[PDB]
Write a protein that binds this ligand. Sequence first.
Ligand code: ITT
Ligand code: ITT
Ligand code: MG
Ligand code: MG
Lengths: 184, 194
Amino acid sequence: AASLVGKKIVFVTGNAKKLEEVVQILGDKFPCTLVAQKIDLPEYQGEPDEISIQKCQEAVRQVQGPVLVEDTCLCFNALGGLPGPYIKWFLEKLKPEGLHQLLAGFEDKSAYALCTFALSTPVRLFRGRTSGRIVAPRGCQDFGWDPCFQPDGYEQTYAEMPKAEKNAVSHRFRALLELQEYFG
Amino acid sequence: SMAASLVGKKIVFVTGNAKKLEEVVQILGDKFPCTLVAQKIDLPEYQGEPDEISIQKCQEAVRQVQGPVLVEDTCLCFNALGGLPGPYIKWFLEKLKPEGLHQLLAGFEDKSAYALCTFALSTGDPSQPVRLFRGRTSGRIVAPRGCQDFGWDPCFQPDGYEQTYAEMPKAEKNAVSHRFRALLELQEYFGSLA
Ligand SMILES: O=P(O)(O)OP(=O)(O)OP(=O)(O)OC[C@H]1O[C@@H](n2cnc3c(O)ncnc32)[C@H](O)[C@@H]1O
Ligand SMILES: O=P(O)(O)OP(=O)(O)OP(=O)(O)OC[C@H]1O[C@@H](n2cnc3c(O)ncnc32)[C@H](O)[C@@H]1O
Ligand SMILES: [Mg+2]
Ligand SMILES: [Mg+2]
């Protein structure tokens, strides 16, 4: 915790859009300095905690310096929290349009979006979560499942929202707030 | 090649799934030139393609057991969903049950599906390669029929048959299953020899 002050932290992720968000959802005065190195890291099957812990332990082996990773899950309550940690693949095969069709046989259109950051130099996690409902796609297409996730309290999806608004209310925000709050 | 090295020897089928073991032992009769010893370890599986998952699972089994080793992974793949849930079928069965796995295709017209079963065999030496053996049955996902004995069987009706895996007597399932097709490749491999 205190050890990482003013240090360099290699943030490892291939995803340009999430990195771009993570830079923006903080700034001066985040104590450390981040450095993006794109590496396509291989994730395990199971629970987001276990996955994130292991994903981080994998990054440690390859970078060896101080390191940070993250995982995002889109979890449908109708489907016991699935696709959850496998969302990436469902998005690859179905796209947002299809993700809505996936719940066509269920009344419960509700869901939640989970974001789990993992840190190393004993691994520590920082979790953020937003509840909502899965709808027919509305808005821009340039970032994953945003078009079909309508968060609770709002009449527009994450894709429709101006990035500024999303960055204030999102699952990522919730997690990043833990990360920042941990230092000071 | 490794066929020669493993013939007559002990191979450890490392799996946590007993029903799956029960079917392997009833498919391979007294007709197998090697001896199977089940050892229950529940192994972690990577995300990705079926082959690379199988390979890696084996290599993990190799680390924990040290002798010759056999592992396997089963997939249930819906064509409407581009081969999903596929290798992550466990977790969908676990949450949705067969009734739910049907409902999953409710808004999709295409009910066609296939089950893929991959076996992965290693000698024990981690440096030389893992040999793979697939089999795949085709069918469609239907409203659950039969009896909840084994996993997703009630909702899978194979092509050319009018009843589901669960409705079939276990003897008929073992004559036509994805796992039978894969163990055929394993028995093809051995029995190229004498
Ligand atoms: O580079 P890494 O860090 O490994 O990230 P990834 O691309 O593999 O992505 P994940 O493992 O976190 O899986 C989440 C999927 O959901 C998408 N995603 C993640 N966060 C999102 C957000 O806030 N809004 C929309 N889509 C998001 C992203 O495109 C991925 O396909
Ligand atoms: O991998 P191991 O350690 O052997 O045990 P497992 O239960 O994790 O096995 P899988 O990875 O193949 O998971 C596939 C899921 O589908 C089920 N399954 C596997 N073969 C099946 C079959 O032939 N008929 C019905 N269900 C099956 C099984 O119970 C799992 O829930
Ligand atoms: Mg990822
Ligand atoms: Mg398994």
